[PDB]
């Protein structure tokens, strides 16, 4: 019944962290068109943990595990902002 609800909860956050790494690497490889496609999914995955609540009875160990995914997502997002600004500057120069 609800061992399913714990893994689903875990998977929701792991997906967010996954897509966050995907975005970062796509930016690192200069794949800007794919990045913008992937962005769509990333935002949808954030919406998912807004629509669904942390279930009751998640243990400390699992909360710690998920907190790790949230931190990793923040770290990636921070790195990504720098690469984005750089690209925006690159593009302004090209645009003229």
């Amino acid at each position: 019944g609800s061992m399913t609800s714990t893994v689903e909860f875990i998977n929701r956050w792991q997906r967010i962290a996954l897509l966050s790494q995907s975005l970062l690497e796509l930016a690192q490889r200069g794949e800007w068109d794919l990045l913008l496609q992937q962005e769509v999914s990333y935002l949808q995955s954030i919406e998912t943990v807004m629509e669904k609540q942390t279930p009751p009875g998640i243990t400390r160990s699992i909360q710690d595990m998920v907190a790790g995914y949230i931190k990793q997502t923040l770290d990636n997002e921070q790195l990504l902002k720098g690469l984005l600004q750089q690209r925006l500057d690159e593009l302004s120069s090209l645009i003229g």
Binding site: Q63, K81, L84
Partner: protein, 56 residues
């Protein structure tokens, strides 16, 4: 010694490719900038979630 008409066609064709290329860059700039602003909001939400996940 190519015809003027022929040179003018090439000129306009290359000019159109430049326009299309610059249009593309502007669209990409706008969307990446939008994305960057959106990361500000998501980071703010994620920071809240981290602290909530850590409580108790």
């Amino acid at each position: 010694n190519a015809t003027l008409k022929s040179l003018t066609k090439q000129y306009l064709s290359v000019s159109n490719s430049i326009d299309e290329t610059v249009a593309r860059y502007k669209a990409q700039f706008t969307q990446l900038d939008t994305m960057m602003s959106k990361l500000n909001n998501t980071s703010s939400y994620l920071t809240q979630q981290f602290t909530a996940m850590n409580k108790s």
